[PDB]
RNA sequence: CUCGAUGUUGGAUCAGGACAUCCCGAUGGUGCAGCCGCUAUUAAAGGUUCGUUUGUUCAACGAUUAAAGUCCUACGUGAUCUGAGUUCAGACCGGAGUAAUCCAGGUCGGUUUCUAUCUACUUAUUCCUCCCUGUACGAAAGGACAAGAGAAAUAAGGCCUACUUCACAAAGCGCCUUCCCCCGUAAAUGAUAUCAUCUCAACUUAGAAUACCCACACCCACCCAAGAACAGGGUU
């Protein structure tokens, strides 16, 4: 859920 | 079990052994100083295309040198302590392009060696030596074993090549080894400052042999070519060589006439064998220079 | 007696034969060139044979900041401010293109190295070329001028206030604050001078050097 | 007398023996003429090494 | 030594040179394969919103041993083909500039002091 | 990488290492014997030799007094030093301390060594005594030695 | 990082049994003539060192209880004395300490 | 094929390769007098700048250079790095829509994990200065190419006597050394085809080696300019 992995 | 000599003898006997072996090896050197009284091999004059056996020396350090024009040249001092020949080989016996000789270097303890080489040095007549390096040579320059190689084997105005082992840095990084730019410091570089970064591509799926990456650097036989002689001093058996040379101080180095196309044919004015001080009508000076070197004790230069 | 700071070798290890050879060479040169005794903080005038100049000779007077190097490559630094601009030279005292040395004045400063004269006021290094030699008696002690020096504001190059330099000519009581000196004494490392394995005893080798100098001189 | 061997045609010029040392740029081809001049045995050696089967008994 | 983006002080007496301006002279190019600039090397210098060629008299790095070092850098203006702008330079300059007098004859002529 | 470095890294800094070996020397000077890890005593041996060399100067030398004050923390052993140990080695110039390797520590299995000022009071150590002159090889050696002496 | 295949017992066995991982058998032991126990060449006999240390520690206890507290280190040499011995003219001026035992075969 | 996860743009480091050559090399033609240029053949050994705003690749601009080449490598490379764009959760503006909310519209901000199990791997060029030379060439103007000498930059390999960062030593900003060519064409004689014709007719011409390493159970322990350990050198 945060761009990412896993921002 | 395996042991050493110092243990199975007494303190009153150790100095006896020391002085005895020192006297013995020094007497061997004094006996082999003069080869002409022995049986020398046939001597031949210089010819075009021929070669000369080099020698090996001991680096002391560096020094400055000034020319007549006042410009500077840094210079290494190479010393030759004993540097005796060890053996001779024939072209068809060694199966090589060219005949070969062997030259020894630094005299060391006869105790820290192997039985085979000890027997070899005994039957040869000389003490042991640190390094025994090989010199390619034509047959006309055949030199007998047990012959000392003095510093007069070379002269000023001469070009030369020198081989030796480099400084040992151990396992070093890709940067100091190969000279990569590295990665910046700030701007968010996370644990990547001196890394090599990429290694190869993605489709290649492997790393090419001969790729640059961290490893042991130094401690290898590297050679420098085209150096030049500025001064020879005979009583100390030291020679000057321009610029610099590989290796640490007090290292053994190999020296040979320069092989370059421009510096190959000049071998007529020089002794085709080594320099034999005995038997000559005259004895050379202590030191001798190139004509374009300001000699100490001479007046300061003054142009016009 | 007095020995030069370049006959003595460096702490590093090597064969004393190298030192002996370079020593006898520089002494064969000393037989010609006089190198009048001097120290740091002495004012020296030097004449050198330069290939390009009016008469191909170059004169230069300056205060000695330091004597560096060993052997034939030994040098001394000179400094002088002329026309409001500060020049410095590094002279090799065994080069043959130098014609002769002269000591206009012989002094010793509290600081063994005087590189802080860069940041010091120009008037301290302002020495005229036309000043004649201050004749000194042939056998007397060395005059030590116990003085202190004013300096440019803080924007320096070397950060002289630290204690590793162990220098005293500067006047930081005026040049900075009690707080800044207390902050600078942070780096105080007494174990440097209290340690006893790092220093280099010289008596042996300097005695040998005296011996060899006397021998080569009388020979 | 592997030195005194003869091909059929212009093989000395057209045929190429190629090998990669392993390093980048180490791909090198040599005509049979060059390969004969440098080693008169290698031609027949390679021919036999090819005719032979590819098992461990080949060596 | 002298390279890109170095505050230099013009030494000769020139209106363009010693005219006060809210930005100091700054070297933005050196006419060598590398970015460093040693004595006797042409460079390019920005003054008062324009740019002109110049020749650096002395740098504050230690070069050769007895070659002089200057506590501050120095440079003199010059036209494209060696016509100096300033009339004279009362400050000292290195003697190593008259080695190339074949090109800087007028720059050496307009000088007074030498070191 | 290091080439020619004579010192070795011991604690959490130069101050820390000189303090450590200072405590070692202060404990060694009074008992004139001490066991400790090999490297520490190895480097401290030179410190002790230099320390007694500067104690030879006597109690008058302000330099040596300040040095001993720094190096010794108990402040009761420097007079002992000047008045006992310098007179003890007034004749000798070197070989002030004997250093001998011993078995490892019990639990840590670290190599240890005992260091001891020569000419102590407490009992001696079981030093390694060289083989007797009466042995076969020593007797043959003495035989040809006396033979050479007779010849010359 | 993470493995991808369970390493086989035979390869693990080759790894952990190669001579590099094995222990060195050392031919560097001999008997001490005094005690009769075995010792490394360059190392001292542990038995002899232990007995010497015990004696040193007991005489240290004695000199400590004699001095009676810290900061009492004298500025003179000191000498031990065992039962059945008299101080010598040489060590009269030197401090003396008494001990309840007899002179062994090795200590002077 | 891969959605029980194949991690993007540009940039940094490292670069491997193709040649459809930007430079340097050798040739043919020219509407090539010469310096300048255009085109075509061969040549991939070597190299192919620094900055201003922009996330930028590109582009514009400034100064240069012999040159500032095109492309492939998972739009090479994020278990090596950055996250400035794009951009989840917040918010402002313009517009759409009643509203929720939306806009390849903008704008500020917004956590980039891994201890390596296996494969693989880990020691010579170029510019410039001088004679050629104001020469040939060229009405003049302009203006060389060859050969030679010198001084430099780059890349590689080494060194501490200067100097510097420094101090028993390590390093550069400092010092020393660096040697071979490349094939496309232009020429002789001469037959098929009796002249001629450079020859896929026989033939004649312009056409890599060298150097480096090299022996061996003394070897507990100690020292080392040798080294993570093992190893290597010394202990006279
Ligand atoms: C402008 C887009 N940006 C900023 C918003 C996103 C950067 S991105 O491209 O890496 C992101 C993840 C993969 N996406 C693809 O479009 C894509 C193309 O091919 C593939 N994916 C296949 C793979 O990449 C295989 C791999 O196994 C897939 C991974 C590791 C995906 C992990 C989960 N990521 C998401 O669910 C992302 C959802 C949003 C953010 C979308 C939209 C914004 C376009 O971004 C992507 O999926 C994006
Ligand atoms: Mg960096
Ligand atoms: Mg992080
Ligand atoms: Mg970091
Ligand atoms: Mg500075
Ligand atoms: Mg403007
Ligand atoms: Mg620790
Ligand atoms: Mg899966
Ligand atoms: Mg996965
Ligand atoms: Mg092509
Ligand atoms: Mg071309
Ligand atoms: Mg990609
Ligand atoms: Mg990309
Ligand atoms: Mg990857
Ligand atoms: Mg990326
Ligand atoms: Mg970002
Ligand atoms: Mg953004
Ligand atoms: Mg949009
Ligand atoms: Mg990461
Ligand atoms: Mg890793
Ligand atoms: Mg550099
Ligand atoms: Mg015909
Ligand atoms: Mg014809
Ligand atoms: Zn025992």
Which value, in Å, is the radius of gyration of the alpha carbons in chain F? 20
Q: Which nucleotides of H are covered by protein (CB under 7 A)?
A: 7, 12-17, 45-46, 50, 62-65, 73-74, 76-83, 87-88, 110-123, 152-164, 166-171, 175-180, 208-228, 233-236
| Chain D residues 14-43 within an 8 A CB cutoff of chain B | 22-24
Distance CA(B29)–CA(B108), nearest Å, equals: 13
Q: Please name the helix (run of DSSP H) or strand (run of DSSP E) that holds residue C68, with its range, or none.
A: strand C57-68
G27 touching chain B per CB within 8 A: yes
CA dist list (Å): B44 to B47, B131, B140, C183: 9, 28, 6, 79
What phi, psi does C206 have (nearest 5°)? -70, -35
DSSP code at position A6? T
Q: Confirm if B132 and B172 have CB atoms less than 8 A apart.
A: no
Across all strands, nucleotide nearest B134 (CA–C1')? H214
Cβ-count burial of B266 within 10 angstroms (0-12 exposed, 13-18 middle, 19+ buried)? middle
Residue C194: name the closest of B276, F152, E38, F70 by CA: F70
The beta-carbon neighbor of C196 closest among F14, F15, F47 is: F47
Cα separation, G11 vs F13, in Å, equals 44
CA geometry: angle C26, C29, C30, nearest 5 deg: 85
Helix axis angle, F62-71 to F14-31, nearest 10°: 100
D40/B166 Cα distance (integer angstroms) = 40
- Å from E102 (CA) to H62 (C1')? 31
User: How far apart are alpha carbons G41 and G29 in whole angstroms?
Assistant: 6
d(CA B121, CA B69): 49
Residue D59 DSSP symbol: -
Enumerate the domain spans of chain E: 1-115
What is the number of domains present in chain G? 1
- Domain membership flag for residue G91: yes
Q: For the domain F10-120, what is the CATH superfamily, name and number?
A: Ribosomal protein L17 (3.90.1030.10)
Distance of alpha carbon B205 from its chain centroid, rounded?
A: 45
Q: What are phi and psi of F41, to 5 degrees?
A: -65, -30
**Residues G17, G15: Cα–Cα separation, whole Å:** 6
What's the structural domain count of chain C?
1
Q: What is the residue range of G106's domain?
A: 27-108
* Cβ <8 Å between C194 and F70: yes
Burial class (CB in 10 A: 0-12, 13-18, 19+), E73: buried
Give the torsion sign (CA, B87, B89, B95, B99): positive
Instruction: Report residue B183 CA to chain centroid gap.
Output: 40
Does residue G80 contact residue G108 with C-beta atoms inside 8 Å?
A: no
User: In angstroms, how far is CA C159 from the centroid of its own chain?
Assistant: 20
Q: Which residue of F has its CA nearest to C189?
A: F15
State the structure-solving technique: cryo-EM
Q: Three-state SS for E61?
A: coil
Q: Find the closest chain F residue to C13 by CA distance.
A: F4
H-assigned helices in G1-108: 9-17, 46-67
Query: What is the dihedral sign for C-alpha F136, F142, F145, F150?
Result: negative
Q: Which residues of E touch C95 (CB under 8 A)?
A: 66
Give exposure, C73-97, as e/b (b: 16+ Cβ within 10 Å): bbbbbbbbbbeebbbbbbbbbbbbb
List residues, by chain if needed, whose CB lies under 5 Å from ion ligand 2. B 182
- Resolution, expressed in angstroms to one decimal: 3.5
Contact (CB, 8 A) for E12 and E86: yes
CA distance C59 to chain E (A): 8
Rounded CA gap, E8 and C199, in Å?
Answer: 44
The strand pair at E26-30 and E42-47 is best described as: antiparallel
In angstroms, the CA E39 to CA E43 distance is 11
Distances in Å between the alpha carbon of C190 and those of C29, C113, C195?
A: 43, 21, 8
Q: Least CA distance to C73: which residue of chain B? A: B64
What DSSP line would sit under chain B, residue for residue? ----SSSSS-TTTHHHHHHHHHHHHHHHHHHHS-SSSS-PPPP----TT-----EEEEEEEEEEEEBTT--EEEEEEEE-S--BEEEE--HHHHTSSSEEEEEE-----SSSS-HHHHHHHHHHTS---S-EEEEEE-STT---SS-B--GGGS-TT-EEEEEEE----EEE-HHHHH------SSSS--S-SS-----S-SSS-S--TT---SEEES-SEEEEEEEE--EEETTTTEEEEES--SS-TT-EEEEEE--SSTTSS--SSS-SS----TT-SS---SEEE-TTBPPTTSPPP---
CA distance B10 to C190: 48
- In order of B76, B249, B293, C156, C171, the CA distances from B65 in angstroms are 10, 19, 8, 37, 43
Tell me the CA distances in angstroms from C110 to C6, C62, E83, one per residue in order.
20, 18, 50
CB proximity list for G72: less than 8 A, separation 6 or greater: F76
Parallel, antiparallel, or unpaired: how do β-strands G95-98 and G78-81 relate? parallel
DSSP tag of F30: H
CA of residue D8 to C1' of nucleotide H194, angstroms? 33
* Distance of residue C40 Cα from the nearest chain F Cα, in angstroms: 26
């Amino acid at each position: 859920x945060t761009x990412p992995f896993x921002x | 079990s395996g042991t050493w000599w110092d243990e199975h003898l007494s303190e009153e006997n150790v100095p006896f052994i020391k002085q005895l072996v020192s006297d013995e090896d020094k007497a061997q050197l004094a006996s082999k100083l003069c080869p002409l009284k022995d049986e020398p091999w046939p001597i031949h004059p210089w010819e075009p295309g021929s070669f000369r056996v080099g020698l090996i020396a001991l680096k002391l350090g560096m020094m400055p040198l000034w020319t007549k024009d006042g410009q500077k040249h840094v210079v290494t001092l190479l010393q030759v302590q004993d540097c005796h020949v060890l053996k001779y080989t024939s072209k068809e016996n060694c199966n090589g392009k060219m005949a070969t000789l062997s030259v020894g270097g630094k005299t060391v303890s006869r105790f820290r060696k192997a039985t085979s080489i000890l027997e070899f040095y005994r039957e040869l007549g000389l003490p042991p030596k640190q390094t025994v390096k090989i010199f390619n040579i034509t047959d006309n320059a055949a030199i007998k074993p047990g012959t000392p190689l003095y510093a007069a084997h070379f002269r000023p105005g001469q070009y030369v090549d020198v081989t030796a082992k480099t400084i040992g840095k151990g396992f070093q990084g890709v940067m100091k080894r190969w000279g990569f730019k590295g990665q910046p410091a700030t701007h968010g570089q996370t644990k990547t400052h001196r890394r090599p970064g990429a290694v190869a591509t993605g489709d290649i799926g492997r790393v090419w042999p001969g790729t640059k990456m961290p490893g042991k650097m130094g401690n290898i036989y590297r050679t420098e070519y085209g150096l030049k002689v500025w001064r020879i001093n005979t009583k100390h058996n030291i020679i000057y060589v321009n610029g610099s040379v590989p290796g640490h101080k007090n290292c053994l180095v190999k020296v040979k006439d320069s092989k370059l196309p421009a510096y190959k044919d000049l071998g007529k004015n020089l002794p085709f064998p080594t320099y034999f001080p005995d038997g000559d009508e005259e004895e050379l000076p202590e030191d001798l220079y190139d004509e374009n070197v300001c000699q100490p004790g001479a007046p300061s230069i003054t142009f016009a | 007696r007095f020995l030069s700071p370049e006959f003595i070798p460096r702490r590093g290890r090597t064969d004393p034969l190298k030192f002996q050879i370079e020593r006898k060479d520089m002494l064969e040169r000393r037989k010609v060139l006089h190198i009048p005794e001097f120290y740091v903080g002495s004012i020296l005038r030097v004449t050198t044979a330069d290939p390009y100049a009016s008469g191909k000779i170059s004169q230069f007077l300056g205060i000695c900041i330091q004597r560096s190097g060993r052997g034939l490559g030994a040098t001394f630094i000179l400094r002088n401010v002329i026309e409001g601009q500060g020049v410095e030279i590094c002279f090799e005292l065994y080069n043959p293109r130098v014609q002769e040395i002269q000591v206009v004045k012989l002094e010793k400063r509290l600081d063994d190295s005087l590189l802080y004269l860069r940041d010091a006021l120009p008037e301290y290094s302002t020495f005229d070329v036309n000043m004649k030699p201050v004749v000194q008696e042939p056998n007397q002690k060395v005059p030590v001028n116990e003085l202190k020096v004013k300096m440019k504001p803080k924007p320096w190059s070397k950060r002289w206030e630290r204690p590793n330099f162990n220098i005293k000519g500067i006047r930081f009581d005026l040049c900075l604050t009690e707080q800044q000196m207390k902050e600078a004494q942070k780096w105080n490392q007494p174990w440097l001078e209290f340690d006893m394995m790092r220093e280099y005893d010289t008596s042996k080798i300097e005695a040998a050097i005296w011996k060899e100098i006397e021998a080569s001189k009388r020979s | 007398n592997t030195r005194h061997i003869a091909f059929s045609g212009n093989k000395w010029e057209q045929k190429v023996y190629s090998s990669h040392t392993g390093y980048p740029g180490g791909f090198r081809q040599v005509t049979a003429a060059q390969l004969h001049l440098r080693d008169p045995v290698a031609i027949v050696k390679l021919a036999i090494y090819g005719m032979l089967p590819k098992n461990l008994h080949r060596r | 030594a002298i390279q890109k983006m170095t505050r230099v002080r013009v030494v000769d007496n020139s209106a363009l040179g010693n005219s006060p301006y809210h930005r100091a002279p700054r070297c933005i190019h050196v006419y060598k394969k590398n970015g460093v600039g040693k004595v006797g090397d042409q460079i390019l210098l920005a003054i008062k919103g324009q740019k002109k060629k110049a020749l650096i008299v002395g740098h504050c790095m230690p070069g050769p041993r007895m070659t002089p070092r200057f506590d501050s850098n120095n440079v003199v203006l010059i036209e494209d083909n060696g016509n100096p702008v300033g009339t004279r330079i009362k400050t000292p300059i290195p003697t190593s500039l008259r080695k190339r007098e074949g090109e800087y004859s007028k720059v050496l002529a307009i000088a007074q002091n030498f070191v | 990488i290091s080439h020619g470095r004579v010192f070795r890294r011991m604690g959490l800094g130069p101050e820390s290492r000189i303090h450590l070996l200072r405590n070692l020397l202060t404990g060694l000077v009074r008992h004139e014997r001490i066991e400790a890890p090999w490297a520490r005593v190895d480097e401290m041996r030179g410190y002790a030799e230099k320390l007694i060399d500067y104690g030879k100067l006597g109690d008058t030398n302000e330099r040596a007094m300040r040095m001993a004050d720094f190096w010794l923390t108990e402040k009761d052993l420097i007079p002992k030093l000047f008045q006992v140990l310098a007179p003890r080695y007034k004749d000798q110039t070197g070989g002030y301390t004997r250093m001998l390797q011993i078995p490892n520590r019990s639990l840590d299995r670290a190599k240890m060594a005992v260091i001891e000022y020569k000419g102590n009071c407490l009992p001696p150590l079981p030093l390694p005594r060289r083989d007797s002159h009466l042995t076969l090889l020593n007797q043959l050696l003495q035989g040809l030695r006396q033979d050479l002496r007779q010849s010359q | 990082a993470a493995p991808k295949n369970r390493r086989t017992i035979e390869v693990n066995r080759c790894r952990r049994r190669n001579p590099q991982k094995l222990i060195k058998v050392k031919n560097n032991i001999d008997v001490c003539p005094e005690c009769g126990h075995l010792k490394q060449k360059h190392v001292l006999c542990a038995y002899c060192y232990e007995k010497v240390c015990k004696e040193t520690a007991e005489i240290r206890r004695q000199i400590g209880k004699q001095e009676g507290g810290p900061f009492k280190a004298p500025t003179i040499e000191t000498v031990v004395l065992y039962t059945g011995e008299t101080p010598s003219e040489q060590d009269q001026g030197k401090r003396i300490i008494e001990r309840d035992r007899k002179r062994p075969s090795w200590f002077t």
